[PDB]
């Protein structure tokens, strides 16, 4: 059989939410994608031997209330909290995005440090590991540019959802 999963990607403007989503649904790096386009995308993959259909909401546009975004998040099964490793403000914003999820939802989440390919790092991996431990969630490093860690981010979120569903 198969299993479907309703996923959401959040994080500051410009961290690579769309780039990560497009690496998952198209397998290449799309470096220019309208920052205002918020939509859900579907991709069938196989995770640990099971056919898995991932619906992914790539959040975008004005950071003002959107009822469709709110209703999708309220019924979302898992969330990626994305920051960019060369942007300290994006990392400092993670708590804000996690609070928004807690206000609308045990919630499966994965902390994602994107843009790992950039040498201009400002957030140490150890800093991010401390934050993910404080939340009780996994931390995964990614590069949407090289595809490093992309399947790890999404598939770890699916594995967290499976654990949650067993409770």
Ligand X SMILES: Nc1nc2c(ncn2[C@@H]2O[C@H](COP(=O)(O)OP(=O)(O)O)[C@@H](O)[C@H]2O)c(=O)[nH]1
Does 60 participate in binding Mg ion (rule CB under 5 A)? Answer: yes
Does 57 participate in binding Mg ion (rule CB under 5 A)? Answer: no
Cα distances from 77 to residues 10, 30, 35, 126, 147, in angstroms, run 13, 26, 24, 27, 24
- Write the interaction track for ligand X spanning residues 122-151; mark x where CB under 6 A is met and - where it is not: ---------------------xxx------
Does 39 participate in binding ligand H40 (rule CB under 6 A)? Answer: no
Query: Looking at beta carbons only, is 38 or 160 nearer to Mg ion?
Result: 38
Which one, of 138, 65, 134, lies nearest residue 104 by Cα?
Answer: 65
Half-sphere exposure of 4 (CA within 13 A, CB side): 6
Q: Among the candidate windows 61-69, 99-107, 109-117, 123-131, which touches ligand X by CB under 6 A?
A: 109-117
Helix (H/G/I), strand (E/B), else coil: 47: strand
Does 40 participate in binding ligand H40 (rule CB under 6 A)? Answer: no
Which residue among 7, 8, 10, 19 contacts ligand X (CB under 6 A)? 19
> Hey, which residues between 53 and 92 contact ligand X (CB under 6 A)?
60
| Distance separating alpha carbons of residues 107 and 77, to the nearest angstrom | 7
Count residues near Mg ion (CB under 5 A).
3
Count residues near ligand X (CB under 6 A).
19
Q: How far is the CB of 136 from ligand X (least distance, A)?
A: 25
One-character DSSP codes across 71-125:
HHHHT-SEEEEEEETT-HHHHHTHHHHHHHHHHH----EEEEEE-TT-S---S-H
- Which strands, in side-by-side order, build the sheet including 2-11? 39-47, 50-58, 2-11, 78-84, 109-114, 139-141
Q: List contacts with ligand H40 (CB under 6 A).
A: 10, 13-14, 35, 59-61, 63-64, 69-70, 73, 100, 104
Binding residues (CB under 5 A) for Mg ion: these are 17-18, 60
């Amino acid at each position: 059989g198969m299993t479907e999963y309703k996923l959401v990607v959040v994080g500051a403007c410009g961290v690579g939410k769309s780039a990560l989503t497009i690496q998952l649904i198209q397998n290449h790096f799309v470096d220019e994608y309208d920052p205002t386009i918020e939509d859900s995308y579907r991709k069938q993959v196989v995770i640990d031997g099971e056919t898995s259909l991932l619906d992914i909401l790539d959040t975008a546009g004005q950071e003002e209330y959107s009822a469709m975004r709110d209703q999708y998040m309220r019924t979302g099964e898992g969330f990626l909290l994305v920051f960019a490793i060369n942007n300290t403000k994006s990392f400092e914003d993670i708590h804000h995005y996690r609070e928004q999820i807690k206000r609308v939802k045990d919630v499966p989440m994965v902390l994602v440090g994107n843009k790992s390919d950039l040498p201009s790092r400002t957030v140490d991996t150890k800093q991010a590991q401390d934050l993910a431990r404080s939340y009780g969630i996994p931390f995964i490093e990614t590069s949407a540019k090289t595809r490093q860690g992309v399947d790890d981010a999404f598939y770890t979120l699916v594995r967290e959802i499976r654990k949650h569903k067993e409770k």
